[PDB]
Amino acid sequence: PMPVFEDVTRALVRELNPRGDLTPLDSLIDFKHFRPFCLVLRKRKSTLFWGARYVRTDYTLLDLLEFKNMLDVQVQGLVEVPKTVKVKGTAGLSQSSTLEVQTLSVAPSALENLKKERKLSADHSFLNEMRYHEKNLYVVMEAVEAKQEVTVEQTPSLALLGLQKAVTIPKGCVLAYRVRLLRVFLFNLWDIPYICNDSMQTFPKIRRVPCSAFISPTQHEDFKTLKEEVQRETQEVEKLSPVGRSSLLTSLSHLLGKKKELQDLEQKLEGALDKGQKVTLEALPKDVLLSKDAMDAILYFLGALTELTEEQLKILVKSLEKKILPVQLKLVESTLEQNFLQDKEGVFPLQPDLLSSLGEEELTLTEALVGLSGLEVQRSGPQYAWDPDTRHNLCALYAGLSLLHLLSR
C-alpha cells in the first residue's frame, strides 16, 4: 500500500466515475495484473472506504479457455491530483495539477466471439480449485491508465511528542479498473453479465447426493453505511468475554508498536481464513477461542489499522494509556459524519466541547493523530480543515478507534 499513489487513484476514481463501481488501485507493484482480461478475487473483509477491493491471480480469462486486437482504446483527457500532491514530468521545471489518462476496454465483439468459439478448460487446475471452493471470479473489463510517465509526491505536535514520499507512475500504469463477475454453467459454458448482481455467484452449488450408493456430485458510499459496517464488526468482537476482550487488547497492544508484525498478523490471518486451514497464530490470545466470524472481524480491523502510519499506531498506544480514545473517536466520527460527501476542501468551526477535556499532552496526541489522517485541527479557534481526498485515511482511523475503544471501554 503506497500512500501517495492511493491518494491519486482514489481521487481519480471520485472524479471519473462519481458514485460508480470503478475500483481505485491502492498500489502499483503489480498493476499488470489489473489489466483487461485479468482475473481477480474479492479481498476478504474488504471495504469501499479504504484499501484494496480485489487481489491478483496468476491468470487471465484467456488462460481458462480451451491482448491488443480485442481492446478498444479511448483517450479520456485530464484528471486532477489531490491538492497535496504535485506532478512532475510534463510541465518542465515547473509542475502540474493534472494527469492525462486513457481507458482500455474489452471490445464487445471480442467477448461475444470468445463466448461463441471457446469453452472453459475442464483440465485447468486453478479453475477446478476455485470451482470446488465456490470462489467468485471477476474479470477486468476496463482499465484506466496513465497516458505518460509522471512522478507524484506529497507536500509541530509530532516534534513535541518526540516521535516524528514520491512515486514514479510508468506510462500505461493501471490507475483504476472495472470488473464484472464471471459466470460458469454446465459443460464449461460461460458468460460475463453486463449488469452484475450481488446475489450472483460464479459457480453453481454442487453437492454429493445424500444416502446414495454413488459418489458423483450434482446440481452505497455514505457515512451511514460506514457506521453500520464498523458496527457489525464491533458487534462481532463484543461477543467475547470481558476477559477475552482484555486478552485480545493485550496482544494488539503489543502489535501496534510494531507495524511490520501487525501486517504479518494481517496477512497470515487473511491467508488462513481464505485457504480455510487451522488458525494457529501466536499474536492472538491463547486463552480465548475465536469463532470464525470473530477472526474475520479482527481481520477487518487489522485492515483498518494497517492503513495508518507507524506514528499513528504508537499514538494509539499512548492514547490508550491516557484513556482518551472516547474523545478522539467522537472527534473523528463527528467530523466524518458532518463532511462525508463534501467534494471540496473547506474550513470549519469546531465544537469547543470536543477538545475541551484534553490536557496539553492529550490534546497534542489527538492533534497529531487526526492530523496524520489528513484532518488539520487548529486549537485556537478551534477550527478544522476538511480535505475530501484523505477521507479514506480518516475512515480507517474511525474503524481503528472503534475497535480499540470497545476493547478498553
UniProtKB/Swiss-Prot annotation:
<dbReference type="GO" id="GO:0043065">
    <property type="term" value="P:positive regulation of apoptotic process"/>
</dbReference>
<dbReference type="Pfam" id="PF17708">
    <property type="entry name" value="Gasdermin_C"/>
</dbReference>
<protein>
    <recommendedName>
        <fullName>Gasdermin-A3</fullName>
    </recommendedName>
</protein>
<feature type="coiled-coil region">
    <location>
        <begin position="220"/>
        <end position="283"/>
    </location>
</feature>
<keyword id="KW-0564">Palmitate</keyword>
<feature type="region of interest" description="Triggers pyroptosis">
    <location>
        <begin position="2"/>
        <end position="219"/>
    </location>
</feature>
<dbReference type="GO" id="GO:0036331">
    <property type="term" value="P:avascular cornea development in camera-type eye"/>
</dbReference>
<keyword id="KW-1210">Necrosis</keyword>
<keyword id="KW-0449">Lipoprotein</keyword>
<keyword id="KW-0963">Cytoplasm</keyword>
<dbReference type="GO" id="GO:0035019">
    <property type="term" value="P:somatic stem cell population maintenance"/>
</dbReference>
<dbReference type="InterPro" id="IPR007677">
    <property type="entry name" value="Gasdermin"/>
</dbReference>
<feature type="transmembrane region" description="Beta stranded">
    <location>
        <begin position="161"/>
        <end position="169"/>
    </location>
</feature>
<dbReference type="GO" id="GO:0031069">
    <property type="term" value="P:hair follicle morphogenesis"/>
</dbReference>
<dbReference type="GO" id="GO:0005886">
    <property type="term" value="C:plasma membrane"/>
</dbReference>
<dbReference type="GO" id="GO:0001942">
    <property type="term" value="P:hair follicle development"/>
</dbReference>
<dbReference type="GO" id="GO:0001949">
    <property type="term" value="P:sebaceous gland cell differentiation"/>
</dbReference>
<feature type="binding site">
    <location>
        <begin position="10"/>
        <end position="14"/>
    </location>
    <ligand>
        <name>a cardiolipin</name>
    </ligand>
</feature>
<dbReference type="GO" id="GO:0030879">
    <property type="term" value="P:mammary gland development"/>
</dbReference>
<dbReference type="GO" id="GO:0032731">
    <property type="term" value="P:positive regulation of interleukin-1 beta production"/>
</dbReference>
<keyword id="KW-0496">Mitochondrion</keyword>
<comment type="similarity">
    <text>Belongs to the gasdermin family.</text>
</comment>
<dbReference type="GO" id="GO:0005634">
    <property type="term" value="C:nucleus"/>
</dbReference>
<dbReference type="GO" id="GO:2001238">
    <property type="term" value="P:positive regulation of extrinsic apoptotic signaling pathway"/>
</dbReference>
<dbReference type="GO" id="GO:0090090">
    <property type="term" value="P:negative regulation of canonical Wnt signaling pathway"/>
</dbReference>
<feature type="transmembrane region" description="Beta stranded">
    <location>
        <begin position="67"/>
        <end position="81"/>
    </location>
</feature>
<keyword id="KW-0812">Transmembrane</keyword>
<dbReference type="GO" id="GO:0042633">
    <property type="term" value="P:hair cycle"/>
</dbReference>
<dbReference type="GO" id="GO:0051886">
    <property type="term" value="P:negative regulation of timing of anagen"/>
</dbReference>
<keyword id="KW-1003">Cell membrane</keyword>
<dbReference type="Pfam" id="PF04598">
    <property type="entry name" value="Gasdermin"/>
</dbReference>
<dbReference type="InterPro" id="IPR040460">
    <property type="entry name" value="Gasdermin_pore"/>
</dbReference>
<keyword id="KW-0175">Coiled coil</keyword>
<keyword id="KW-0217">Developmental protein</keyword>
<dbReference type="InterPro" id="IPR041263">
    <property type="entry name" value="Gasdermin_PUB"/>
</dbReference>
<dbReference type="GO" id="GO:0031966">
    <property type="term" value="C:mitochondrial membrane"/>
</dbReference>
<dbReference type="GO" id="GO:0005829">
    <property type="term" value="C:cytosol"/>
</dbReference>
<dbReference type="GO" id="GO:0043588">
    <property type="term" value="P:skin development"/>
</dbReference>
<dbReference type="GO" id="GO:0097191">
    <property type="term" value="P:extrinsic apoptotic signaling pathway"/>
</dbReference>
<feature type="transmembrane region" description="Beta stranded">
    <location>
        <begin position="85"/>
        <end position="106"/>
    </location>
</feature>
<dbReference type="GO" id="GO:0022829">
    <property type="term" value="F:wide pore channel activity"/>
</dbReference>
<keyword id="KW-1134">Transmembrane beta strand</keyword>
